[PDB]
Design a protein around this motif. Sequence first.
Motif, PDB file in Angstrom:
ATOM      1  N   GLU A 115       0.870  -1.105  -0.041  1.00  5.77           N
ATOM      2  CA  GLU A 115      -0.089   0.015   0.125  1.00  5.77           C
ATOM      3  C   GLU A 115       0.835   1.192  -0.200  1.00  5.77           C
ATOM      4  O   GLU A 115       0.331   2.270  -0.456  1.00  5.77           O
ATOM      5  CB  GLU A 115      -0.880   0.014   1.444  1.00  5.77           C
ATOM      6  N   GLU A 118       1.452   2.958  -3.619  1.00  8.62           N
ATOM      7  CA  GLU A 118       0.409   4.132  -4.107  1.00  8.62           C
ATOM      8  C   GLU A 118       0.224   5.103  -3.226  1.00  8.62           C
ATOM      9  O   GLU A 118      -0.517   6.151  -3.520  1.00  8.62           O
ATOM     10  CB  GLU A 118      -1.030   3.109  -4.195  1.00  8.62           C
ATOM     11  N   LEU A 122       3.719   7.015  -5.978  1.00  4.67           N
ATOM     12  CA  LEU A 122       2.882   7.217  -6.988  1.00  4.67           C
ATOM     13  C   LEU A 122       2.633   8.806  -6.913  1.00  4.67           C
ATOM     14  O   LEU A 122       2.583   9.514  -7.825  1.00  4.67           O
ATOM     15  CB  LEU A 122       1.782   6.655  -7.089  1.00  4.67           C
ATOM     16  N   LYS A 126       3.678  11.799  -9.867  1.00  2.00           N
ATOM     17  CA  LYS A 126       2.790  12.234 -11.064  1.00  2.00           C
ATOM     18  C   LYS A 126       1.753  13.280 -10.109  1.00  2.00           C
ATOM     19  O   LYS A 126       0.790  13.135 -10.148  1.00  2.00           O
ATOM     20  CB  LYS A 126       2.140  11.341 -11.660  1.00  2.00           C
ATOM     21  N   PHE A 130      -2.671  13.529 -11.573  1.00  2.39           N
ATOM     22  CA  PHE A 130      -3.807  13.205 -10.879  1.00  2.39           C
ATOM     23  C   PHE A 130      -4.787  14.731 -11.031  1.00  2.39           C
ATOM     24  O   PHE A 130      -6.225  14.337 -11.084  1.00  2.39           O
ATOM     25  CB  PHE A 130      -3.433  13.278  -9.349  1.00  2.39           C
ATOM     26  N   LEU A 133      -6.297  13.301 -14.338  1.00  2.11           N
ATOM     27  CA  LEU A 133      -7.159  12.208 -13.885  1.00  2.11           C
ATOM     28  C   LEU A 133      -8.527  12.836 -12.796  1.00  2.11           C
ATOM     29  O   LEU A 133      -9.515  12.192 -12.958  1.00  2.11           O
ATOM     30  CB  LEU A 133      -6.659  11.190 -12.757  1.00  2.11           C
ATOM     31  N   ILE A 135      -7.815  13.615  -9.552  1.00  6.73           N
ATOM     32  CA  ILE A 135      -7.557  12.965  -8.366  1.00  6.73           C
ATOM     33  C   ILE A 135      -6.823  13.934  -7.287  1.00  6.73           C
ATOM     34  O   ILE A 135      -5.712  14.731  -7.906  1.00  6.73           O
ATOM     35  CB  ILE A 135      -7.041  11.762  -8.592  1.00  6.73           C
ATOM     36  N   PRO A 137      -4.768  12.597  -3.893  1.00  8.79           N
ATOM     37  CA  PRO A 137      -4.812  11.725  -2.887  1.00  8.79           C
ATOM     38  C   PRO A 137      -4.695  12.443  -1.363  1.00  8.79           C
ATOM     39  O   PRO A 137      -4.686  13.749  -1.492  1.00  8.79           O
ATOM     40  CB  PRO A 137      -3.585  10.830  -3.294  1.00  8.79           C
ATOM     41  N   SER A 138      -4.449  11.648  -0.617  1.00  7.97           N
ATOM     42  CA  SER A 138      -4.312  12.246   0.858  1.00  7.97           C
ATOM     43  C   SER A 138      -2.990  13.128   1.209  1.00  7.97           C
ATOM     44  O   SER A 138      -2.220  13.033   0.247  1.00  7.97           O
ATOM     45  CB  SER A 138      -4.438  11.266   2.053  1.00  7.97           C
ATOM     46  N   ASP A 265      -5.152  11.687   7.214  1.00 10.16           N
ATOM     47  CA  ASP A 265      -6.389  11.169   6.830  1.00 10.16           C
ATOM     48  C   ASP A 265      -6.311   9.624   6.989  1.00 10.16           C
ATOM     49  O   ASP A 265      -6.765   9.027   7.564  1.00 10.16           O
ATOM     50  CB  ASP A 265      -6.284  11.471   5.230  1.00 10.16           C
ATOM     51  N   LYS A 266      -5.351   9.052   5.948  1.00 13.42           N
ATOM     52  CA  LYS A 266      -5.311   7.505   6.238  1.00 13.42           C
ATOM     53  C   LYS A 266      -5.025   7.029   7.488  1.00 13.42           C
ATOM     54  O   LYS A 266      -4.096   7.305   8.196  1.00 13.42           O
ATOM     55  CB  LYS A 266      -4.404   6.925   5.179  1.00 13.42           C
ATOM     56  N   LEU A 267      -5.793   5.971   7.845  1.00  7.73           N
ATOM     57  CA  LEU A 267      -5.522   5.193   9.158  1.00  7.73           C
ATOM     58  C   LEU A 267      -4.755   3.907   8.672  1.00  7.73           C
ATOM     59  O   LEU A 267      -5.626   3.036   8.210  1.00  7.73           O
ATOM     60  CB  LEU A 267      -6.520   5.124  10.130  1.00  7.73           C
ATOM     61  N   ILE A 268      -3.543   3.789   8.956  1.00 10.42           N
ATOM     62  CA  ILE A 268      -3.045   2.499   8.705  1.00 10.42           C
ATOM     63  C   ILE A 268      -2.370   1.619   9.710  1.00 10.42           C
ATOM     64  O   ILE A 268      -1.889   2.212  10.718  1.00 10.42           O
ATOM     65  CB  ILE A 268      -1.835   2.533   7.497  1.00 10.42           C
ATOM     66  N   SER A 361      -9.909  -1.111  14.699  1.00  6.26           N
ATOM     67  CA  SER A 361      -9.852  -1.036  13.255  1.00  6.26           C
ATOM     68  C   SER A 361     -10.975  -1.364  12.455  1.00  6.26           C
ATOM     69  O   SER A 361     -11.275  -0.730  11.302  1.00  6.26           O
ATOM     70  CB  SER A 361      -8.557  -1.472  12.819  1.00  6.26           C
TER      71      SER A 361
ATOM     72  N   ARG B  44     -13.128   9.509  -2.527  1.00  4.67           N
ATOM     73  CA  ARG B  44     -11.718   9.527  -2.738  1.00  4.67           C
ATOM     74  C   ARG B  44     -11.052   8.468  -2.934  1.00  4.67           C
ATOM     75  O   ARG B  44     -10.190   8.001  -3.620  1.00  4.67           O
ATOM     76  CB  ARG B  44     -11.240  10.759  -1.678  1.00  4.67           C
ATOM     77  N   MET B  48      -9.060   5.725  -5.707  1.00  3.57           N
ATOM     78  CA  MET B  48      -7.938   4.958  -5.454  1.00  3.57           C
ATOM     79  C   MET B  48      -8.057   3.611  -5.927  1.00  3.57           C
ATOM     80  O   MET B  48      -7.451   2.969  -6.528  1.00  3.57           O
ATOM     81  CB  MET B  48      -7.608   5.254  -4.080  1.00  3.57           C
ATOM     82  N   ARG B  52      -6.292   1.878  -8.592  1.00  4.57           N
ATOM     83  CA  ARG B  52      -5.128   0.611  -8.652  1.00  4.57           C
ATOM     84  C   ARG B  52      -5.513  -0.484  -9.594  1.00  4.57           C
ATOM     85  O   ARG B  52      -4.611  -1.067  -9.808  1.00  4.57           O
ATOM     86  CB  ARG B  52      -5.662   0.126  -7.040  1.00  4.57           C
ATOM     87  N   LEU B  69      -8.477   6.755 -20.529  1.00  3.85           N
ATOM     88  CA  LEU B  69      -9.697   7.306 -20.265  1.00  3.85           C
ATOM     89  C   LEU B  69     -11.120   6.620 -20.515  1.00  3.85           C
ATOM     90  O   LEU B  69     -12.033   6.413 -19.699  1.00  3.85           O
ATOM     91  CB  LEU B  69      -9.842   8.907 -20.643  1.00  3.85           C
ATOM     92  N   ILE B  86     -10.726   0.850   5.396  1.00  2.60           N
ATOM     93  CA  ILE B  86     -10.505   1.418   6.500  1.00  2.60           C
ATOM     94  C   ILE B  86     -11.766   2.458   6.733  1.00  2.60           C
ATOM     95  O   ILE B  86     -11.949   3.163   7.650  1.00  2.60           O
ATOM     96  CB  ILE B  86      -9.307   2.091   6.722  1.00  2.60           C
ATOM     97  N   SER B  89     -14.164   3.245  10.492  1.00  6.23           N
ATOM     98  CA  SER B  89     -13.147   3.290  11.551  1.00  6.23           C
ATOM     99  C   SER B  89     -13.546   3.325  12.901  1.00  6.23           C
ATOM    100  O   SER B  89     -13.252   2.459  13.502  1.00  6.23           O
ATOM    101  CB  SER B  89     -12.032   4.288  10.968  1.00  6.23           C
TER     102      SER B  89
END
Lengths: 363, 363
Positions: A115, A118, A122, A126, A130, A133, A135, A137-138, A265-268, A361, B44, B48, B52, B69, B86, B89
């Motif tokens: 994970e 990405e 990524l 780029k 995005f 695209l 997009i 991301p976080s 943002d992301k909880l990993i 989680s 969002r 992803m 992916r 596209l 996630i 959460s």
Amino acid sequence: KEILMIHTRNMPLGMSEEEKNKFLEEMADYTYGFVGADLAALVRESAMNALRRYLPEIDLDKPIPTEILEKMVVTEDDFKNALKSIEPSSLREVMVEVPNVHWDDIGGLEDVKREIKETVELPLLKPDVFKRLGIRPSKGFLLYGPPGVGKTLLAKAVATESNANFISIKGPEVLSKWVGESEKAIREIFKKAKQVAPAIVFLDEIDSIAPRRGTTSDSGVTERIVNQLLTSLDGIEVMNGVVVIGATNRPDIMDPALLRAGRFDKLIYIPPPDKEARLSILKVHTKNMPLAPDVDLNDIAQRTEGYVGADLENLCREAGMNAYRENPDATSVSQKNFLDALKTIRPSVDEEVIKFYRTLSET
Amino acid sequence: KEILMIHTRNMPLGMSEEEKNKFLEEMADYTYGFVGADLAALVRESAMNALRRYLPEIDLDKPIPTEILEKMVVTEDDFKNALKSIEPSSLREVMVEVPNVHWDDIGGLEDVKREIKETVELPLLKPDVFKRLGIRPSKGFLLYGPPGVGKTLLAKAVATESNANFISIKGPEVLSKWVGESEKAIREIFKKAKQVAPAIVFLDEIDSIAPRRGTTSDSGVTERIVNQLLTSLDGIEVMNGVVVIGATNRPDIMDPALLRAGRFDKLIYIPPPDKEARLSILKVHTKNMPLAPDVDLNDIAQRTEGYVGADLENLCREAGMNAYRENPDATSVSQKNFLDALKTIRPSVDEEVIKFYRTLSET
């Protein structure tokens, strides 16, 4: 190394035909107290390390013989004696550094590690695409799981992968700078990384800031560091090549408003390894040290379950002392050593902290 | 529905060209208890999930072809992986519901409903004349009786009919905050109803600590929460027609002040379901699912005695599951399924709890 060679230009020791410990890079790995001229003083200290042994035992005077200027040399040890002699000056802070940690150095778990491709790499390559695209991301993620286990190394892995120099901000590093009210400088480190961009800003064990201060007069009940972190996020974006990476043992206790989405943002979750990952991370440690396969790496995997990466990286590291190979106390690698280490190593005896993660989680 | 739709105009999920229901109400079900930010992160993280699939397999770098596209089409699987991701959460913070139920949506006893209308509809629509006649039917009223039937549903039917705002306090919210020594958060929802009034505020076990003890109250019948309920019930003005509703599973735990004038004027008792009521309830639940005229709806009711709305609803869902899952036949659920499903179950309401109710209503 390019500055030292100028003082090797001032010495007839020779280099690149002489390759040896005196190679300037290996000695450059020791010192951050210094800058260009301090090295001139250092080589003078090293050059003085020589004269103090040479000249006094000669007992020189107005006559200076030529033989001494001939037979005299500058060894590798005097550098060490000069390196161990320290006069640290350069600014108090943490500096950018490029480690060697990479997918090759992380046994870990491919699922959570994959994970990171990405999540960081990524977005780095780029940022303009995005937009095409459509997009964004976080702004960063948050790691939580068993203590140790290499969660700090996971960021050093994506550090070399990102081809950008790396800064690790750890709880103790902020506290020592906090007493001097340098938290504004801790924020400057992030603006500094931007001027150095691309660079990775890594916030480590950020739950380590509050515990010692309870609730006292920081910004008020919420910390000034939190205030510095809130403002630290004002400057950065998903646009910049700089990546925020959270790592936390207890991503609750402090002030979840800052941990709120849009900030981190992301909880990993970093899970503890398993038999196979326990074996993989084990193979990574044992390959460097001499190995006598009296142990069955799957058998010592049978004995071992419920052990986190910290215990393993320590167990791999701890049993190495119990075993002795190339010296004359020697006892080779055997299940006995890993058997005695089984008692020395502390298992995971708390499934509480483990279930707080799994329950929180999941839902 | 609106939030997701804003996200659905920039992405072609709005109209249904695919094998699911893409009217966003379907995606709204699993999303219960989210806010605009959480949904933005959901969709969002969905880009992803989409990213992916498409980008790694093609793995472009500089180029931006038209086919990538064209090839990209957002699929339901992304949300499914996101909803499994996630995305759920933490349970975040407390919320208040919105009502629906009317006479059409729920059945049940006619005796209490009309009794509730006397208490609710009349003071709301005709408070003026009641002031000058020396006739005050009620200020607020208490609902007590057999649990599990969702007596809240009855309060919503009259509330929606009378066009008065309905408010429900879920027991778990009262359970946790009472331990945290916070009764103010409990006031807020009630105060929110007082200002927007005329309104009907329903309280589901606002005393919830006490009903957990079952029959009795080990401590006094009064606690910190009711003290303000007492104060509030009295503190209400005539500037707005206002009717407060306490509701509990156990009425015997009440502070005697509650039952008095200006607080609880009327005491509502829902007696066990009537034989004819069970029939209607059984019919409303069974025709929301696959049904066929293979049965006799009165016969299944005869075997049912003492069963409540919660029991009758279980019979319908259980029958179809054991019934034909997919058939060309005109019959989906059969009479044999209803009949046989009754032999296993038992009546919910028990005699002990019934006696404790009857004595109070009389006294």
